Amino acid sequence: TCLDPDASRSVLGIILGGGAGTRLYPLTKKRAKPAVPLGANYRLIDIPVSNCLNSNISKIYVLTQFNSASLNRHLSRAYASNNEGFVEVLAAQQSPENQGTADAVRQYLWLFEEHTVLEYLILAGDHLYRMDYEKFIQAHRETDADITVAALPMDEKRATAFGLMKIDEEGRIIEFAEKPQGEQLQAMKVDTTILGLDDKRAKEMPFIASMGIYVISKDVMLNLLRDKFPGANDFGSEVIPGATSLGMRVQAYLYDGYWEDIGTIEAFYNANLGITKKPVPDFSFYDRSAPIYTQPRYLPPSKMLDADVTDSVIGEGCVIKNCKIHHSVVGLRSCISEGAIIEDSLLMGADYYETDADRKLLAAKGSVPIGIGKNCHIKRAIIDKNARIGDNVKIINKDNVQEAARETDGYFIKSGIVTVIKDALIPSGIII
Amino acid sequence: QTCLDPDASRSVLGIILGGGAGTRLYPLTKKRAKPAVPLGANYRLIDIPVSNCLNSNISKIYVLTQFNSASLNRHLSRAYEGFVEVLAAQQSPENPDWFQGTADAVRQYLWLFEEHTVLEYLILAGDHLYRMDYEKFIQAHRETDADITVAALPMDEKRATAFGLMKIDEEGRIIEFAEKPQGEQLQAMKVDTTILGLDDKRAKEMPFIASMGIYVISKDVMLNLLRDKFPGANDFGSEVIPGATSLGMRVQAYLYDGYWEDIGTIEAFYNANLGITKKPVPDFSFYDRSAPIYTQPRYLPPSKMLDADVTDSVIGEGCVIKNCKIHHSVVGLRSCISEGAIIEDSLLMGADYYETDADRKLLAAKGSVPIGIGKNCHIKRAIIDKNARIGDNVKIINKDNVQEAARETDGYFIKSGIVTVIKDALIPSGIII
Amino acid sequence: QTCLDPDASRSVLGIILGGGAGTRLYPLTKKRAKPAVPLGANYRLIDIPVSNCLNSNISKIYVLTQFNSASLNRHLSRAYASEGFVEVLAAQQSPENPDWFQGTADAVRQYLWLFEEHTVLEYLILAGDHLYRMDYEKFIQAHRETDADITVAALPMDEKRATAFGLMKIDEEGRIIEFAEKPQGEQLQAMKVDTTILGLDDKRAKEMPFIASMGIYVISKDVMLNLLRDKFPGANDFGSEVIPGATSLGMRVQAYLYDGYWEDIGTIEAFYNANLGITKKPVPDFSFYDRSAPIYTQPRYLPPSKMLDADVTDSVIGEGCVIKNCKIHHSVVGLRSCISEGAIIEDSLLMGADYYETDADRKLLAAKGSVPIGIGKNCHIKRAIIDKNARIGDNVKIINKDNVQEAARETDGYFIKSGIVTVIKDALIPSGIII
Amino acid sequence: LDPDASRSVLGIILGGGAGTRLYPLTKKRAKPAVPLGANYRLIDIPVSNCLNSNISKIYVLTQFNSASLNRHLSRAYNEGFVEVLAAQQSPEGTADAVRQYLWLFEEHTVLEYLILAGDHLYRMDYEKFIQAHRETDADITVAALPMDEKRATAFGLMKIDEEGRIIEFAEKPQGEQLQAMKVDTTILGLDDKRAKEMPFIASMGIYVISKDVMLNLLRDKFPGANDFGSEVIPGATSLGMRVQAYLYDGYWEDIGTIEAFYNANLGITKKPVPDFSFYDRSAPIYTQPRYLPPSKMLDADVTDSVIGEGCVIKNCKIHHSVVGLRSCISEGAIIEDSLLMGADYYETDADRKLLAAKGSVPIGIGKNCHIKRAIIDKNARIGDNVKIINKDNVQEAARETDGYFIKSGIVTVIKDALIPSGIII
Numbered sequence A: 001t002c003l004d005p006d007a008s009r010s011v012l013g014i015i016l017g018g019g020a021g022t023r024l025y026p027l028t029k030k031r032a033k034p035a036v037p038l039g040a041n042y043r044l045i046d047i048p049v050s051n052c053l054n055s056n057i058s059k060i061y062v063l064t065q066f067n068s069a070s071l072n073r074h075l076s077r078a079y080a081s082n083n084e085g086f087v088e089v090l091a092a093q094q095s096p097e098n099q100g101t102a103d104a105v106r107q108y109l110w111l112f113e114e115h116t117v118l119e120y121l122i123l124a125g126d127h128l129y130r131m132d133y134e135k136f137i138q139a140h141r142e143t144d145a146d147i148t149v150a151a152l153p154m155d156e157k158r159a160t161a162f163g164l165m166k167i168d169e170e171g172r173i174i175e176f177a178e179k180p181q182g183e184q185l186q187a188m189k190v191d192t193t194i195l196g197l198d199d200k201r202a203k204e205m206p207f208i209a210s211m212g213i214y215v216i217s218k219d220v221m222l223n224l225l226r227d228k229f230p231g232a233n234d235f236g237s238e239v240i241p242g243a244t245s246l247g248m249r250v251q252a253y254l255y256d257g258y259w260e261d262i263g264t265i266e267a268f269y270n271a272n273l274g275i276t277k278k279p280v281p282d283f284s285f286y287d288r289s290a291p292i293y294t295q296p297r298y299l300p301p302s303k304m305l306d307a308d309v310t311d312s313v314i315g316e317g318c319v320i321k322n323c324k325i326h327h328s329v330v331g332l333r334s335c336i337s338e339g340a341i342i343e344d345s346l347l348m349g350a351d352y353y354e355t356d357a358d359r360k361l362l363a364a365k366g367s368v369p370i371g372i373g374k375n376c377h378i379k380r381a382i383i384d385k386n387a388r389i390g391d392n393v394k395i396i397n398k399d400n401v402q403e404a405a406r407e408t409d410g411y412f413i414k415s416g417i418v419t420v421i422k423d424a425l426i427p428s429g430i431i432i
Numbered sequence B: 001q002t003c004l005d006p007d008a009s010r011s012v013l014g015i016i017l018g019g020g021a022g023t024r025l026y027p028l029t030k031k032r033a034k035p036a037v038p039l040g041a042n043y044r045l046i047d048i049p050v051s052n053c054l055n056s057n058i059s060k061i062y063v064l065t066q067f068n069s070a071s072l073n074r075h076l077s078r079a080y081e082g083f084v085e086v087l088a089a090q091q092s093p094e095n096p097d098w099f100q101g102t103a104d105a106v107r108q109y110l111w112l113f114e115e116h117t118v119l120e121y122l123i124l125a126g127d128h129l130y131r132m133d134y135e136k137f138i139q140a141h142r143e144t145d146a147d148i149t150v151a152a153l154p155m156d157e158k159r160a161t162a163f164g165l166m167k168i169d170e171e172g173r174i175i176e177f178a179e180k181p182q183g184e185q186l187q188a189m190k191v192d193t194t195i196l197g198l199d200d201k202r203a204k205e206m207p208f209i210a211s212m213g214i215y216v217i218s219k220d221v222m223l224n225l226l227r228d229k230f231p232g233a234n235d236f237g238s239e240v241i242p243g244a245t246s247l248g249m250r251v252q253a254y255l256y257d258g259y260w261e262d263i264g265t266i267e268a269f270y271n272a273n274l275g276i277t278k279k280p281v282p283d284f285s286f287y288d289r290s291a292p293i294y295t296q297p298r299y300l301p302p303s304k305m306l307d308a309d310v311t312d313s314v315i316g317e318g319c320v321i322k323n324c325k326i327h328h329s330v331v332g333l334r335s336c337i338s339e340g341a342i343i344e345d346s347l348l349m350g351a352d353y354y355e356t357d358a359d360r361k362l363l364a365a366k367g368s369v370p371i372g373i374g375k376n377c378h379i380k381r382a383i384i385d386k387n388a389r390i391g392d393n394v395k396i397i398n399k400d401n402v403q404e405a406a407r408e409t410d411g412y413f414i415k416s417g418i419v420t421v422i423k424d425a426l427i428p429s430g431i432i433i
Numbered sequence C: 001q002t003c004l005d006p007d008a009s010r011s012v013l014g015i016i017l018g019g020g021a022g023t024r025l026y027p028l029t030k031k032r033a034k035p036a037v038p039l040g041a042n043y044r045l046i047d048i049p050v051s052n053c054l055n056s057n058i059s060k061i062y063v064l065t066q067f068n069s070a071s072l073n074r075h076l077s078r079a080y081a082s083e084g085f086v087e088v089l090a091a092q093q094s095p096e097n098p099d100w101f102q103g104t105a106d107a108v109r110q111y112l113w114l115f116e117e118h119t120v121l122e123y124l125i126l127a128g129d130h131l132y133r134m135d136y137e138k139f140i141q142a143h144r145e146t147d148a149d150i151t152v153a154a155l156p157m158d159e160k161r162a163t164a165f166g167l168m169k170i171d172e173e174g175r176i177i178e179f180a181e182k183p184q185g186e187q188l189q190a191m192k193v194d195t196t197i198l199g200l201d202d203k204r205a206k207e208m209p210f211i212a213s214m215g216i217y218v219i220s221k222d223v224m225l226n227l228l229r230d231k232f233p234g235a236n237d238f239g240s241e242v243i244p245g246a247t248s249l250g251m252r253v254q255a256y257l258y259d260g261y262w263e264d265i266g267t268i269e270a271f272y273n274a275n276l277g278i279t280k281k282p283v284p285d286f287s288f289y290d291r292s293a294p295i296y297t298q299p300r301y302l303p304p305s306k307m308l309d310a311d312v313t314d315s316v317i318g319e320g321c322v323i324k325n326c327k328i329h330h331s332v333v334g335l336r337s338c339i340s341e342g343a344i345i346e347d348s349l350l351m352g353a354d355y356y357e358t359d360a361d362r363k364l365l366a367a368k369g370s371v372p373i374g375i376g377k378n379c380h381i382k383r384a385i386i387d388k389n390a391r392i393g394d395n396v397k398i399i400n401k402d403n404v405q406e407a408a409r410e411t412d413g414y415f416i417k418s419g420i421v422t423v424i425k426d427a428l429i430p431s432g433i434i435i
Numbered sequence D: 001l002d003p004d005a006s007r008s009v010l011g012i013i014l015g016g017g018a019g020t021r022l023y024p025l026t027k028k029r030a031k032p033a034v035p036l037g038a039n040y041r042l043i044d045i046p047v048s049n050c051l052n053s054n055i056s057k058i059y060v061l062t063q064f065n066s067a068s069l070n071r072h073l074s075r076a077y078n079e080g081f082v083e084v085l086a087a088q089q090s091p092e093g094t095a096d097a098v099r100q101y102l103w104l105f106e107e108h109t110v111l112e113y114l115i116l117a118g119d120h121l122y123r124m125d126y127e128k129f130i131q132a133h134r135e136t137d138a139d140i141t142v143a144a145l146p147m148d149e150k151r152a153t154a155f156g157l158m159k160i161d162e163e164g165r166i167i168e169f170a171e172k173p174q175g176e177q178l179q180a181m182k183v184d185t186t187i188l189g190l191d192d193k194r195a196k197e198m199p200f201i202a203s204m205g206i207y208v209i210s211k212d213v214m215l216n217l218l219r220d221k222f223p224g225a226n227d228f229g230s231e232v233i234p235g236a237t238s239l240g241m242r243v244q245a246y247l248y249d250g251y252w253e254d255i256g257t258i259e260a261f262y263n264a265n266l267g268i269t270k271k272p273v274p275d276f277s278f279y280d281r282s283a284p285i286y287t288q289p290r291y292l293p294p295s296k297m298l299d300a301d302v303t304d305s306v307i308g309e310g311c312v313i314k315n316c317k318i319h320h321s322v323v324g325l326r327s328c329i330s331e332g333a334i335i336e337d338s339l340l341m342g343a344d345y346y347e348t349d350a351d352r353k354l355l356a357a358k359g360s361v362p363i364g365i366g367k368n369c370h371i372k373r374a375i376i377d378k379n380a381r382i383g384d385n386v387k388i389i390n391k392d393n394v395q396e397a398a399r400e401t402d403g404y405f406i407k408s409g410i411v412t413v414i415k416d417a418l419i420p421s422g423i424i425i
């Protein structure tokens, strides 16, 4: 492995966040998508960013729909330092009221085209994966590629679930397809050994699917967005396929690592309960070499009055009273009162703590303090930031609902997952 | 409403008395400079004074320590018009066998401090737990036009006999000291804490004020006192201060109010550490929305617990807890507690790094005992310094109940009944302490 | 002796008004957001307000600007990115000058929801094209002590200079009770006041019986939301409409006297004079550097300036210049400037260059018959503003003999405003051309 | 490289010690802090090269601590760092300096230790230099500098085999031993027409040592040595260790003495290419940002000179000179063939008045002075009508009590030296 010029001074990271589907609502109701809490100590945005930094990419642009003081403070307090690097948030619009990937990038082509760089690293979507973009860049160069598309291998089963690419002798992408049913699926079968897989697993996974992350030569992208296809919206559907029709060197690169998508409540839910996996969680946030970074907070060590946790992870600066936590992920600052039970749940915690004087007024006012009230029962749920769950609240959804837009009540049910909205106040005794 | 003009940042220099040799806090100091001794699961002593200075708006700070340490330099380096530099008297991680007093350590570097264009020097002992905004303290030093201002800690007769008591006049000016006075000498030190603005009731119970290693000194005064006046004084506030007073210099007292404990003793250190899990609320809390205690950003992941039962305990960052019972203890960063373990009344300083599966399967094929508390162990009333490789079935419970014990070879010490396993130490399986 | 509490850092948000379409400083603003315009040889306009904030202890700063530019972004990134920040809030996200108008109020209102996300007590509103230094704290301190809703920095002046500003009338306590936009005749005469009321002596108060707003305001957070969302949702001008209206509602709009140099540099003529002004003798009315509150800028690490044979009178030389055998009189020479053999620079502002062209490059340019960046051989440039990366060819004489005053020749690389010739950025004027 | 330097290589800069060769420049400040090129300090050379080489771990060994030296380092420069390690507890060998801190260096988990000793202007990507030490399974790769003969015999030399391996060391060898040192630099890198022109390789004082190796060489194999050059490395070779050589051909000019120093400085003003520029499109020499204003010039006629930052120049002439930062030059003064270190700050017109009515001169070149072939240090106060011209073309001398010291005919005014009006030199 060796890139020259150095990636740090020759590559520009462009993360496609913000602009995304409301597939994560209500989590994206009162906040920029990139800012969505993850793993109890992190935020979605921290993944591609950390990967960029760990991959020696120091020039990072975070694309988003609108501006967030929260996103900034997070990115500013955790990365604003890396020299000659930077991590700037570029926002699509001027307000949270109301795009298309290629559109997103094109909007700021005027800014992008200013940096002296060889390639643009286009990272889009929402995934939990650990990649070293460097090897991916090297391939892009050692092939005089104009566009190098990262590809995920898969057997013909889950193959008709994604968009498939076809490669020639050299691995040059020659054709595309969206869930080719069956009569025309086999046509997409290529022998992936050409991309680095061993005959064994290549015969198992004879299909390649776009991963939604690319490397494009500084000049190509400018020409593609600015001239060849100025009216396109998405990349993996228009630009990429179109640059192919023009006969450009569109190369494939195979990623054989962990890759879990999390653009939906269920996927996200399950992804998060994933680090409580036995005996080894397939994805680990911490890594001796390529760890995921976050905002330094200087929170105290979690306190535990009399808790009986089992198969769960606990975030920083927690205050936990006598209770029972099972198979769950407790976010930072999370307060859990007496006799509470938490099961297969993701408690995102809080952004700040409330003092005793505070819990004092709230009481006299008859309101509920931040946290899980006394003797509450939380099952299969996501309790967003600053939730105020009153006493005796039971979130068990016994009738087993699957859809509910109970916003006014501070919640939402999707795929059977109850999700207490951020800053929501769930009154004592309420059952769900 | 009142501010330091000029600002603390550019007119004050922090001089932290990190420590020297670490005789008192041994074995914790063993080949580790005192300022770096692990504190409250995620911090190090040096964090308190430094943090207090940063929050107090003092960005220029030095840390004197008889010997140096690799980690102290890594901590400060990574953790921190400002700077934090270590000024060692001996560039060796080895515990010095020669003595160096505080005025010695300070005077030895007086020449470098002189190079700084500041009005005062803030002399702080890096051995106590507590929070303080030195801004008013300094503010006071200037408004009272004193040569040296001394922080005063009020206390009752009982606590009084183990401190350096001051006697002030009606204007708060100090005019006489007494080192750990008793009998009649003590009686003669009774003062009217009212003068310093103390509560009238909290005054009847605490008619004594003690120096507390906190001082503000005008530049010139310092150079004068250490160069001309007392060039042979070893102890700073034990001689140099009382000495200044006796020369007619303006030595004013500034009443200090709040939690304050000296933690240079194994017992004192122990206590203050387990004192963070005091059922109601710890009298001292590292966290503070306004002035928190800073430490090194480690990016450790959330602590995992397979089947734990924690009571009156605090868990640091990135711990890996299997099935076990943790009671009234402190668990430092990267701590590994194995299956069947039982922790009672202990302070686990944790580890400096995690051991991988490679070192695992290796130390498992050759048998060696990995870092952490081995299976079915039992640690009662102990301190387990960093990277302790504790075999399985170990029972650290001081059966014979020995107060003082020095078995540095077997990998540990014992003080006031506290079994402190030495850093890096290895206690073979079955061992019983 | 006394300071804010809380301190400006956590309780004061800085909102800067970098500019609209920059139609006044054209062509210096041609495809360049106003905040970015090169200033004083080694700075950009935006450095004045941002630096005043930082030096006043204000770490949370936003910069408003109708459009955007790469340079503004790169600059703020490098010079200040380092709980503070200096983010740009643009109306239009393109470098193209907006052909549509937007006001200072429409501007702020547009992002009020963002400003709304900041737990601050006040909003410091600063214009972004005024040359001056100021410790905003005491001024904010006044806003809190007098429990005002809006405090307006006031500038004393004489009848002659008053007619070009927005004047205000104060009562005995200094509470503003009236406004008048660019008042003249008896309209003006009624705006006379007693300056001693704000702390001026009687000698100067007699010399300057007027006080004009100067685009500096402190504003309680909610007074802002209320005024912009409810009380005047249709206002476009923040200072000539929204303020008076708030006054007209009986809100506590208090004045605060400003002492010192202050100069508007948003028009060409004034921009020219202010920039040339640092060459003043025996001293400059305004100095960029200062022991305690300097005007910051991006660290470039450029090498010291190189001079082969320069007869330089009353001038300023920025970082990394390359002068040969020439004459530089009463001029400002920007960073990376390249003045050639036998050149004569009289009374001009050389913006400089964004980069150095290597020998090789010069070879290609010569072979293609083009001009390298910089003032060419035997060039005579007087009373002009030469924008960044200009390629002035050999023997060019920008001397405007026909004494023209206004001329729009954007196609030839220059506009003439008030007799001041301005060469557009990256312009190229061929050998022997006389302007 | 892989792992990369940033994380696998530690930087150890040595530039303290006596180095008295530079008296009185190093009289007060530590050696690394010596002013340079109008806007720099010696230390910026080896530290800048490191950074531009992706070397983050950087230590700087100095005889003693310096308030101004650390401010310069902190202000100018999250895995990397640049820390100063003092050898003594007060300002009143070389293998010893490294050994003394082995305990500190030992802890860092790296693969190599870049050692940089001595002071001299030069730009080099230590990366290709480490890539070498790695592919050649070297345990110590030494800097190889080719040269003719007048040079070849002046410095120690290295004989290599047909693998680049170093087998011998000869300190200033002449005659038949000098001949037994010819090597044909074809192996190192240079071609045939270049090599023939210089078949002699001399060590530079820069080496790449494998982490462990250096730990063994300093505490075991040779815990009583003083120099890396003539003792540790030569011995290290004899003991039979893979000691390689690394060719380096690029502007190399030492500056350990006033004359070398002085000449290198004025050298940056030499016509065409000065041989060495601090700035560079790729790897520039970094320095502390002072936000100094542009330089004012009332009526200066300057020739073949270079103006540093924030200078306040009145009526005067400047010839073949290098004016440092904050230089205040007065009317009628004439500066030629000199180097002005500049000044560390400015004095207000209100502060100056307090000088006249005190019988003292304000920092900077007073009125109608005449500076010829001299080095005027920082904060130098030179009253009206001074004439540092060295009339009786002396050479060496000494007049500490007279704010100056003469060496190689160069009058070097001590930092803060107050030279009264009318005096001459």
Ligand SMILES: Nc1ncnc2c1ncn2[C@@H]1O[C@H](COP(=O)(O)OP(=O)(O)OP(=O)(O)O)[C@@H](O)[C@H]1O
Residues within 6 Å of the ligand: B016, B017, B018, B019, B020, B034, B064, B065, B066, B100, B101, B102, B103, B104, B105, B124, B125, B126, B127, B128, B211, B212, B213, B234, B235, B236, B237, B238, B239, B264
């Ligand atoms: N030689 C030394 N250099 C630096 N710090 C030291 C040295 N000796 C002790 N210290 C540390 O300095 C601080 C002051 O020591 P100590 O608690 O004895 O203060 P004291 O008795 O109030 O006053 P003094 O030490 O002047 O007599 C403590 O935090 C201690 O660990």
Ligand SMILES: Nc1ncnc2c1ncn2[C@@H]1O[C@H](COP(=O)(O)OP(=O)(O)OP(=O)(O)O)[C@@H](O)[C@H]1O
Residues within 6 Å of the ligand: C016, C017, C018, C019, C020, C021, C034, C064, C065, C066, C102, C103, C104, C105, C107, C126, C127, C128, C129, C166, C214, C215, C216, C236, C237, C238, C239, C240, C241, C266
């Ligand atoms: N759309 C805009 N966005 C940001 N700044 C703007 C905009 N339009 C003008 N500006 C800037 O706003 C300032 C104009 O305000 P100024 O202090 O001159 O007061 P004014 O012109 O008398 O009244 P008003 O504030 O209503 O324009 C200038 O600094 C100008 O460049």
